RNA sequence: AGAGUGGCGCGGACGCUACGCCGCGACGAGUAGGAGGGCCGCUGCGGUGAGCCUUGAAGCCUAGGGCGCGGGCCCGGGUGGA
RNA sequence: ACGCGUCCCCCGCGAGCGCACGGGGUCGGCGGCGAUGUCGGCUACCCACCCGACCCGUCUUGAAACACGGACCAAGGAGUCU
């Protein structure tokens, strides 16, 4: 009894730790390998345009995959097609937003609600601040917080999205488990804009705010998150 | 045994080190320094000798009682806190005491104690203010700095020696502390062109003369 | 031998046209006329000084008429010199257009 | 020598005043006691900006401070010296109140007992 | 075993 | 069982006293005096109690015999303990612990046999 | 956190009216009208409180002190007289 | 990337001390004012000033209405048995 069993009780503890230190190095080597991508993809869009402009050519840059969308009109008095389409994007209240992958079925949804939203093509800084500061989960039918790496590894896991680093790749590059890792997220919780709106009612193009902005949605995020 | 060395990465920013942990493998000499694997008392009495116990159980329990707290993260007491200063305050600059029975008075700075309070020293003579403490926050600093490099400032005058007792009376201990700490100070204030009509007089506000504008 | 505080004048509550807020005041500090100017005054102690019928005891004096409400300057307000405040005792509206003292003590010079 | 409780937190409250009934301020035949206005026309039913207000549950006392008097105990009302003994093991949270219509002589016999037993009585000196 |  | 008749008593006995959002129990051998399923003083097959002794001096203790649970004039069994406050409590902790006689009550009968003496001791 | 056949010191908070405690999230307008809960009231009958009262019951009055969001209720004083 | 015992393309229990941006706050920090004139008391009585606030029931698409019942106070007063 015991003197045997206590030493065997000092062999199982060092096993569950060694399950962490073989996993603790992999969180570093996954993050240092995505850093290689974000200089090898960044400078390979400046590579082609010089070497076209060289030979009197042109270079059209890559048309988008991914787009953030924010609900700016309220909740009172609303037409019954639009209530259905704003539901499907999970924008159920004012100043709330979501990730949305793009195709023909995804844009023609976003022409029916195109005076209740603002959307645009986000960057490596407007993907991560949102996912770092604000980003919550949806585990056990609850919006419980992410101050850990055994919530994202524990729910999804089988898709190979374990730490906070793979939620940047799979969204910022729309990869081959995106759906689950974006219905993973509860939609975002932005406060109001600090500076403000130009004119909420109208389309960007006229003067105000509504409809798409291709490269100045980056201005209504660092003001709102 | 082999006495304790100083840390072998210089501090780069609070929290962060400098040399990374394979190159720092080098500097703790890791490669070459491997290894592998009270209660009671028995006193004499007047055949027999007793067994006494140290800490016996109590004879009154109370009827209801509180339970243990959750431990806070990083809450040290005053003693261990860290002390700061300001840019304008340096040793020998000129301070304006703004609060006690002396208020508006021009008072000299000597040395910050380890309770964090100052030593605002009037040259008792001129103002009417001796060795005293005052508190960073309630003291304006001023642009004037006659140097206090070369004189002597005493040790035994430490922060508890000031701390209060109970017609408090000036005993014969604080009279060689009074005139000897100040007669080293007094040959460097009168030598400047016309400075001992200004420490004596009091500052105050009038009009056209607004706190937010002027430099002092 | 003189004054050690800066003169100012309680000039209404924080409010918009038809609902007034009573936990924030609105001082007009003397001779200060933009925002730029109003960093100094921020955080700095302030006092409304007055005089009831009976005797209140003091600290550092005899038991006499004079009392205070104590407070605190918080942030700037508007474009033009003004400032917000937050006393522990919510102010009378008698004091609208009457004196208050901002001090110099918790200084940052 | 007053009795400390076990522990004494910060009592904080949400209102102070009572809730008075609409138009008790005109017809003496209308009693202070509150009633829900069930009108049509009505102003207080609809919450215009000005009038009386209404009881809600957002006027909650918080569970750690409900039934806690200033001294810090909570009442438990009594008639005789046997109903006292009850409290003894729970001295530090609860405090006896000798009842109104209880007599002048039997009231003296009690306050002696809640001395031997450390129990705190809110109405000691009384009938005299 | 590899580090002892 | 015990577990039965609780369901019967719980909210009904002639020993139950409610009011002011509180709730108490005035049963012979309830030590904490509260309507509960640990603390009731008749139901079960074994019982502890701590009563204030005959005259002023001392404390009296009450076990319940395992046998005849249907024979009440010879069911409880009594003893008096009139000794020093730390040493008197040697006995009571040596009744609950080393008999194995119902090991829940331990820390109730240490706070009841120390606010029966803090009485009979003379007042402030 | 498995079980076998062979090679000095008698000591360690609270709990669990399980019809109770405790544990982590999202929401909270409402007239006609539904439904639950009321340790909210008013009068009578069986049980119970080794209840209480001429050393002062009920009712009233009270710029006395306390309790719950709320309906309402607890205590100081004076009257009154079963 | 850092002991060694063997598999290879390709040429399973070391020893302790210590500091902290680490699973929701604590000073192992201080100072005045205290007996017949002052301390405190949100609650309930009178006054004063700034903001807001038209009279209730009611039928009615619409009521502060130039739509009707209401001078004041008590005591009674309307979904019930079979």
Swiss-Prot record, chain B:
In-chain residues carrying the UniProt-annotated modification N6-acetyllysine: 167
Q: Which residues form a coiled coil?
A: none
Which GO biological-process labels does this protein carry?
Answer: cytoplasmic translation; ribosomal large subunit assembly
Write down the Pfam families for this protein, in alphabetical order.
Ribosomal_L6e (PF01159), Ribosomal_L6e_N (PF03868)
Reading the lineage from the top rank, the first entry is: Eukaryota
- Modification type N6-succinyllysine: residues: 43, 152
Q: Which GO terms describe its cellular component?
A: cytosolic large ribosomal subunit; rough endoplasmic reticulum
Which subcellular locations apply to this protein? Answer: Cytoplasm, Cytosol; Cytoplasm; Rough endoplasmic reticulum
Positions of transmembrane segments: none
**Which keywords annotate this record?**
Acetylation, Cytoplasm, Endoplasmic reticulum, Isopeptide bond, Phosphoprotein, Ribonucleoprotein, Ribosomal protein, Ubl conjugation
Kindly list the GO molecular function terms attached to this UniProt entry.
RNA binding; structural constituent of ribosome
CDD domains associated with the record = KOW_RPL6 (cd13156)
| The protein's role, per its UniProt record | Component of the large ribosomal subunit. The ribosome is a large ribonucleoprotein complex responsible for the synthesis of proteins in the cell.
PANTHER family in the record: 60S RIBOSOMAL PROTEIN L6, LARGE RIBOSOMAL SUBUNIT PROTEIN EL6
This protein is called what?
Answer: Large ribosomal subunit protein eL6
The species this protein belongs to is Oryctolagus cuniculus
Swiss-Prot record, chain C:
Q: Which Gene Ontology BP terms does the record give? A: translation
Q: What GO molecular functions are on record for this protein?
A: structural constituent of ribosome; tRNA binding
Keywords, comma-separated and alphabetical: Acetylation, Cytoplasm, Ribonucleoprotein, Ribosomal protein, RNA-binding, tRNA-binding
Record-listed N6-acetyllysine modification sites: 7, 62
Q: Got a GO cellular component term for this one? A: cytosolic large ribosomal subunit
Q: Where in the cell is it found?
A: Cytoplasm
User: Which residues does this entry mark as bearing N6-succinyllysine?
Assistant: 62
So which domain of life are we looking at? Answer: Eukaryota
Q: Name one Pfam family in it.
A: Ribosomal_L35Ae
Q: Which InterPro entries match?
A: Ribosomal_eL33 (IPR001780), Ribosomal_eL33_CS (IPR018266), Ribosomal_eL33_sf (IPR038661), Transl_B-barrel_sf (IPR009000)
Main localization of the protein described in the UniProt heading: cytoplasm
- What does the UniProt function comment say about this protein? Component of the large ribosomal subunit. The ribosome is a large ribonucleoprotein complex responsible for the synthesis of proteins in the cell. Required for the proliferation and viability of hematopoietic cells.
> What family is this protein classified in?
Belongs to the eukaryotic ribosomal protein eL33 family.
Assembly behavior: Component of the large ribosomal subunit.
> What is the protein named?
Large ribosomal subunit protein eL33
Q: Which organism is it from?
A: Oryctolagus cuniculus (Rabbit)
UniProtKB/Swiss-Prot annotation, chain E:
Name the encoding gene, please.
RPL29
Q: How does it assemble?
A: Component of the large ribosomal subunit.
| Protein known as | Large ribosomal subunit protein eL29
Q: Where in the cell is it found?
A: Cytoplasm
Query: Which family, according to UniProt?
Result: Belongs to the eukaryotic ribosomal protein eL29 family.
Function of the molecule: Component of the large ribosomal subunit. The ribosome is a large ribonucleoprotein complex responsible for the synthesis of proteins in the cell.
Q: Which domain of life is it from?
A: Eukaryota
From Swiss-Prot, chain F:
Report residues of the Glycyl lysine isopeptide (Lys-Gly) (interchain with G-Cter in SUMO2) crosslink: 57, 64
Q: Which Pfam families match?
A: Ribosomal_L28e
Residues with N-acetylserine modification? 1
Is Ribosomal protein given among the entry's keywords? yes
Q: Which GO terms describe its biological process?
A: translation
Tell me where on the tree of life, at the top rank, the source sits. Answer: Eukaryota
> What cellular component terms from Gene Ontology apply here?
cytoplasm; ribonucleoprotein complex; ribosome
Instruction: According to the UniProt record, list the residues that bear Phosphoserine.
Output: 114
Going by the UniProt record, its keywords in alphabetical order are:
Acetylation, Cytoplasm, Isopeptide bond, Phosphoprotein, Ribonucleoprotein, Ribosomal protein, Ubl conjugation
Which is one GO molecular function term here? structural constituent of ribosome
Where does the record say this protein resides?
A: Cytoplasm
Q: Which residues form a coiled coil?
A: none
User: Mind telling me which InterPro entries this protein's record contains?
Assistant: Ribosomal_eL28 (IPR002672), Ribosomal_eL28/Mak16 (IPR029004)
Is this entry keyworded Acetylation? yes
* Family label: Belongs to the eukaryotic ribosomal protein eL28 family.
What this protein is reported to do is described as:
Component of the large ribosomal subunit. The ribosome is a large ribonucleoprotein complex responsible for the synthesis of proteins in the cell.
PANTHER family tied to this protein: 60S RIBOSOMAL PROTEIN L28
Q: How does it assemble?
A: Component of the large ribosomal subunit.
The entry's protein name is Large ribosomal subunit protein eL28
Lineage start? Eukaryota, Metazoa, Chordata, Craniata, Vertebrata
Q: Which gene encodes it?
A: RPL28
């Amino acid at each position: 009894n015991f003197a045997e069993l206590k030493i065997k009780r000092l062999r199982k503890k060092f096993a569950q730790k060694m399950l962490r230190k073989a996993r603790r190095k992999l969180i570093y080597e996954k993050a240092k390998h995505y850093h290689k991508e974000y200089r090898q993809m960044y400078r390979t869009e400046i590579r082609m345009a010089r070497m076209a402009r060289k030979a009197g050519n042109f270079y059209v840059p890559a048309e988008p995959k991914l787009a953030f969308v924010i609900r700016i009109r309220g909740i009172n008095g609303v037409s019954p097609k639009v209530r259905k389409v704003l539901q499907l994007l999970r924008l159920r209240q004012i100043f709330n937003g979501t990730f949305v992958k793009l195709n023909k079925a995804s844009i023609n949804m976003l022409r029916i609600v195109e005076p209740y939203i603002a959307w645009g093509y986000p960057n490596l800084k407007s993907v991560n601040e949102l996912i770092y500061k604000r980003g919550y989960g949806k585990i056990n039918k609850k919006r419980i917080a992410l101050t850990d790496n055994t919530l994202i590894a524990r729910s999804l896991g089988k898709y190979n999205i374990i730490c906070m680093e793979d939620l940047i790749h799979e969204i910022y590059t729309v990869g081959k488990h995106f759906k689950e890792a974006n219905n993973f997220l509860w939609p975002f919780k932005l406060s109001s804009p600090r500076g403000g709106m130009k004119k909420k009612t109208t389309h960007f193009v006229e003067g105000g705010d509504a409809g798409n902005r291709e490269d100045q949605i980056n201005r209504l995020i660092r003001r709102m998150n | 045994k082999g006495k304790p060395h100083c840390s072998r990465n210089p501090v780069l920013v609070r929290g962060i080190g400098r040399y990374s942990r394979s190159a720092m493998y080098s500097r703790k000499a890791l490669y070459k320094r491997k290894y592998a694997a009270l209660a009671t008392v028995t006193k004499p009495v007047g055949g027999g000798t007793r067994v006494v116990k140290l800490r016996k159980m109590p004879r009154y329990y109370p009827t209801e009682d509180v339970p243990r707290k959750l431990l806070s993260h990083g809450k040290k007491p005053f003693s261990q806190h860290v002390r700061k200063l300001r840019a304008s305050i340096t040793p020998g600059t000129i301070l304006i005491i703004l609060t006690g029975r002396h208020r508006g008075k021009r008072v000299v700075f000597l040395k910050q104690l380890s309770s964090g309070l100052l030593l605002v020293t009037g040259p008792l003579s001129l103002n009417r203010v001796p060795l005293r403490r005052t508190h960073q926050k309630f003291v304006i600093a001023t642009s004037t700095k006659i140097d206090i490099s070369g004189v002597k400032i005493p040790k035994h005058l430490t922060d508890a020696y000031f701390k209060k007792k109970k017609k408090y009376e000036i005993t014969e201990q604080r009279k060689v502390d009074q005139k000897a700490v100040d007669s080293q100070i007094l040959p460097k204030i009168k030598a400047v062109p016309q400075l001992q009509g200004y420490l004596r007089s009091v500052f105050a506000l009038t009009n056209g003369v607004y706190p937010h504008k002027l430099v002092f | 031998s003189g004054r050690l505080w800066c003169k100012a004048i309680f000039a209404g509550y924080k409010r918009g046209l038809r609902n007034q807020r009573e936990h924030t005041a609105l001082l007009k500090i003397e001779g200060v006329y933009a925002r730029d100017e109003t960093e100094f005054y921020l955080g700095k102690r302030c006092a409304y000084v007055y005089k009831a019928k009976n005797n209140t005891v003091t600290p550092g004096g005899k038991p006499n008429k004079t009392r205070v409400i104590w407070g605190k300057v918080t942030r700037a307000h508007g474009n033009s010199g003004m400032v917000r405040a937050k006393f522990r005792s919510n102010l009378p509206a008698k004091a609208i257009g009457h004196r208050i003292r901002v001090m110099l003590y918790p200084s940052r010079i | 020598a007053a009795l400390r409780p076990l522990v004494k937190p910060k009592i904080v409250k949400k209102r102070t005043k009572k809730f008075i009934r609409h138009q008790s301020d005109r017809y003496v035949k209308i009693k202070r006691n509150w009633r829900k206005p069930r009108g049509i026309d009505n102003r207080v039913r609809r919450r215009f900006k000005g009038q009386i207000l209404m009881p809600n549950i957002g006027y909650g006392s918080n569970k750690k401070t409900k039934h806690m008097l200033p001294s810090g105990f909570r009442k438990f009302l009594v008639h005789n010296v046997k109903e006292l003994e009850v409290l003894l093991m729970c001295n530090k949270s609860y405090c006896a109140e000798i009842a109104h219509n209880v007599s002048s002589k039997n009231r003296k016999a009690i306050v002696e007992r809640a001395a031997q037993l450390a129990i705190r009585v809110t109405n000691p000196n009384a009938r005299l | 075993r590899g580090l002892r | 069982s015990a577990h039965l008749q609780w369901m019967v008593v719980r909210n009904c006995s002639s020993f139950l006293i409610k009011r002011n959002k509180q709730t108490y129990s005035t049963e012979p051998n309830n030590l904490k005096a509260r309507n509960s399923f640990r603390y009731n003083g008749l139901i079960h097959r074994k019982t502890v109690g701590v009563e204030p002794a005959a005259d002023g001096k001392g404390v009296v203790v009450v076990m319940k015999r395992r046998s005849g649970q249907r024979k009440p004039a010879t069911s409880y069994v009594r003893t008096t303990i009139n000794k020093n406050a730390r040493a008197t409590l040697s006995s009571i902790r040596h009744m609950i612990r080393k008999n194995k006689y119902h090991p829940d009550l331990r820390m109730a009968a240490i706070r009841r046999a120390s606010a029966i003496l803090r009485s009979q001791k003379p007042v402030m």
